[PDB]
């Protein structure tokens, strides 16, 4: 529901990201329903899962290398995480592959935290990830139809591209 400007964009995004990161952290191929993101949530969660897994599984060695290199364990670490995420777009090129990589990275860290039973840090992490990720790309996301444009881009293989 529109209250300020792009309130809907944040909620839909947060729900999907929170769901995706928490889901993957369990280690199983589960998929829980959204409370607000019905159409966008299911379309985006399904795509984000397929893409997020493909990205992190392919560059798994690189992800794990950074995962072991990262000293992330508390709420203070999110400052660096948010900085790294925005740093990826420092050249001004907001490519989807970079955006999803940051999400797959978040999921990778979510799993790392869940593996040691530190869910208490996963919630604030997923929140910071969604907040900073969207905050620094508001206009770009709203102009790109949000998750609608996101799913279509990764569906050009053989689903809804042509």
């Amino acid at each position: 529901g529109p209250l300020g400007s792009e309130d809907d964009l944040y909620r839909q995004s947060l729900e999907i990201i929170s769901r995706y990161l928490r889901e993957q952290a369990t280690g199983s191929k589960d998929s829980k329903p959204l409370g607000e993101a019905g159409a966008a949530g299911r379309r985006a969660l399904e795509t984000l899962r397929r893409v997020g897994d493909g990205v992190q599984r392919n560059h798994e060695t690189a992800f794990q290398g950074m995962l072991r290199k990262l000293d992330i364990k508390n709420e203070g670490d999110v400052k660096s995480f948010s900085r790294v995420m925005v740093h990826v777009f420092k050249d001004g090129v907001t490519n989807w592959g970079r955006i999803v990589t940051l999400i797959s990275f978040g999921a990778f860290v979510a799993k790392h935290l869940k593996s040691v039973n530190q869910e208490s840090f996963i919630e604030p992490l997923a929140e910071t990830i969604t907040d900073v990720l969207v905050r620094t790309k508001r206009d770009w996301l709203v102009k790109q139809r949000g998750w609608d444009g996101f799913v279509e881009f990764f569906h050009v293989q053989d689903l809804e591209g042509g």
């Binding site: 560059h59 000293d71 970079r98 999803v100």
Partner: peptide, 27 residues
Amino acid sequence: AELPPEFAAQLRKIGDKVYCTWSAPDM
């Protein structure tokens, strides 16, 4: 006990390659 900004570069390079991999279909 420190944050070496290699993740930023690594993730950046990964994103570029990933984007180029998803944009180009099996054609």
